[model samples]
Target: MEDEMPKTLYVGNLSRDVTEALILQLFSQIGPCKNCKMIMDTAGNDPYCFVEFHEHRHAAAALAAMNGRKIMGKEVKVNWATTPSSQKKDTS
Candidate 1:
């Protein structure tokens, strides 16, 4: 109910060529990650995804380091997202 420390990031401005593995690889460079969710739509919409890190500090570092960074010829946008409930699940 209250504001939770953000651990999920909404990454936008992705090119069609971007893949879930690419996203995971990109963030993993900064810190350990939980998962990456690529949002695919039938309609003509811009590509985007969500990346959840294992810790809030890791997510914050990623947002600062990657926001406005270019990927696949496009400048990607990174911002905090509401932490997903599923993130509470153990990866072990």
Candidate 2:
């Protein structure tokens, strides 16, 4: 059997204008997106996001199709997320 692929993707080089809803819609074109976390850096650093798919193959498809794709005049990078999906909920 083939090794299991990661269902989460790390998307970098995001424009400040991009929102979580936008990310969810973008990745959802490939398949059902389970969750999306937009990292809005308050330190003036570039923004990024983590998109989790319902299945590993969907994540893989997004990685292949969306990587290096330009959004808001920036070429976004897509890769497997280093961390697995979290089970905890935000208190806030």
Candidate 3:
């Protein structure tokens, strides 16, 4: 979400075993997180989560360090979440 600025990183390709506590602990290795939440989809398979840091750079650092790394027997995908067109950044 654009409101999160760059402080939020989207984490996908997760194993069912991945938990909020696990993500919080992992991201803490890069920097402190303001909040974290895991989202379960309709089928209840292929879950994902979001981790937000107070500083944008902290989120980027976590993405760079954790992306493509294996956790809970799965290689995770980490990147900045896409904001909807309606939520585009304010250039002003």
Candidate 4:
């Protein structure tokens, strides 16, 4: 069996002008994206988002390929979601 992969990816350093279509277009190359929406905080500082894929492996692949890539005149960052399971914090 293969190792488990992350289903969601964290995207940061997005430009205020970035659109859903832009994200969709970029991530589509990796795989079928379940959802991609940029969170627009009222304060409008540090724009970022989460993109969920149908498959964890696809998300992982996208993170690997898309991280530190530039879009909309800004360099974007991508990473796997830091969940308890993914982090695997040892209680013992």
Candidate 5:
């Protein structure tokens, strides 16, 4: 696993049927993706999913590629997730 984050993306408005494999396949188009992860709801509940790209360049490319892409008739919002790790966190 990559010790540091590569600006993973958060994919919102995913259909309940969307799977992890699909996320990987779609993100692969951006660049040489090292890893892709999808986070579903807890308790087996279905919720909007998240996709983590392997590199920031890939992530940025994904943003351009995935922006306004429609799946299951819904527009998917792709961007860098609003997480502390997305930026250089100050850890003392």
Candidate 6:
């Protein structure tokens, strides 16, 4: 079996100006981010982004490191993300 991917956090309430590089720059200062992606074309002014770190500890560090951090003239919101788990077939 393959190893599970590292945990990540879903950071929301991002300003439209927020970019992957910006998120990487800020988050990487504390710890490296494995991946940084932004969801666009939503029906809102502010968009959201997700950041995956090489280790779960980095996710926690990113949260604690950038919690309530102000970027692009906006206070950033960082939080842990809830992801879908594996599904099993019903035995019944």
Rank by lDDT, highest first: 1, 2, 3, 4, 6, 5
The runs of at least 3 residues in candidate 2 whose Cα sits more than 4 Å from the true structure, single-residue gaps closed, are 1-4, 83-92
Q: Give the clashing pairs for model 5.
A: none
Ten-residue stretch with the least lDDT total in model 3: 81-90
What are the per-residue Cα lDDT tens digits for candidate 5 across 1-92? 34344465777776667766776788877766665556666676435555655567667878878877986677878856644544565673
Clashes of each: 0, 0, 0, 0, 0, 0
The residue pairs in collision within model 4 are none
TM-score of 6: 0.74
TM-score of each: 0.82, 0.80, 0.76, 0.78, 0.65, 0.74
Q: What is the lDDT of candidate 2?
A: 0.80
Tens digits of lDDT, candidate 1, 1-92 = 53467788998888778777777887999989987888886698987888888888778889988999988799999988886465556574
- Per-residue lDDT of 5 in model 3: 63
Query: In candidate 4, what are the lDDT values of residues 5-57, reduced to their tens digit?
Result: 56778898887688878788778888998877688877868888888888776
Worst 10 residues of 5 by lDDT: 1-10
| Candidate 4 residue runs with Cα over 4 Å from true position | 1-4, 83-92
Candidate that beats the other on lDDT, 1 or 2, i.e. the better one: 1
Q: Give me the candidate number with maximum lDDT.
A: 1
Taken over the whole model, the C-alpha lDDT of each candidate is 0.83, 0.80, 0.79, 0.78, 0.66, 0.72
Find the number of clashing residue pairs for candidate 3: 0
Give per-residue CA lDDT, model 3, range 4-90, as digits (tens): 566668898987677778878989988888888788677867788888787776778899888998987999999897434365566
